[PDB]
Design a protein around this ligand. Structure first.
Ligand code: CL
Length: 160
């Protein structure tokens, strides 16, 4: 039966059938997760640019990289940024479905450098759940912060 799990490690080392990149705008290599995805799957950046609020899949070999561009809350208002963040996750769920994968590795979009200086764990994770609950895939959420790992794990446990 489909599950959610959380792991505190580099998503570029995931054990799932595809990966969601927390993509920088304009198809650029970015930083953090996006830069790690660029180092591991550089071929997946060929024509990967896609607008804020959308996702675009590019294959590296046969391994799918779903580039999802969340809003940068330093540029967006809270209300418009929230809408684009929800929309990016909804496009991820559509791509996961279209690909037919059994599992997907996902980071929390619009956190950290794109968070506008605010902790958005709950906001981003709730949009992740809303989108991915519509799919049949095992979801493995990747984070790096120890307290975030606890809170995500707590949230996963209470939906079981
Ligand atoms: Cl984190």
């Amino acid at each position: 039966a489909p599950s959610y799990r959380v792991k505190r490690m580099d998503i570029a080392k995931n054990d799932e059938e595809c990966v969601v990149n927390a993509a920088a705008p304009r198809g650029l290599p970015g930083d953090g997760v996006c830069k790690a995805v660029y180092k591991k799957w550089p071929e997946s950046f060929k024509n990967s640019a896609t607008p804020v609020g959308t996702a675009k899949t590019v294959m590296c070999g046969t391994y799918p990289v779903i580039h999802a561009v969340g809003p940068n809350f330093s540029n967006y208002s809270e209300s418009e940024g929230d809408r684009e963040l929800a929309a990016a996750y909804r496009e991820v769920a559509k791509e996961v479905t279209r690909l037919g994968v059994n599992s997907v590795a996902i980071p929390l979009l619009s956190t950290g450098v794109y968070s506008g200086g605010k902790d958005r764990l709950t906001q981003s994770l709730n949009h992740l759940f809303t989108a991915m609950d519509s799919t049949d895939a095992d979801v493995v959420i990747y984070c790096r912060d120890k307290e975030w790992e606890k809170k995500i794990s707590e949230a996963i446990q209470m939906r079981t």
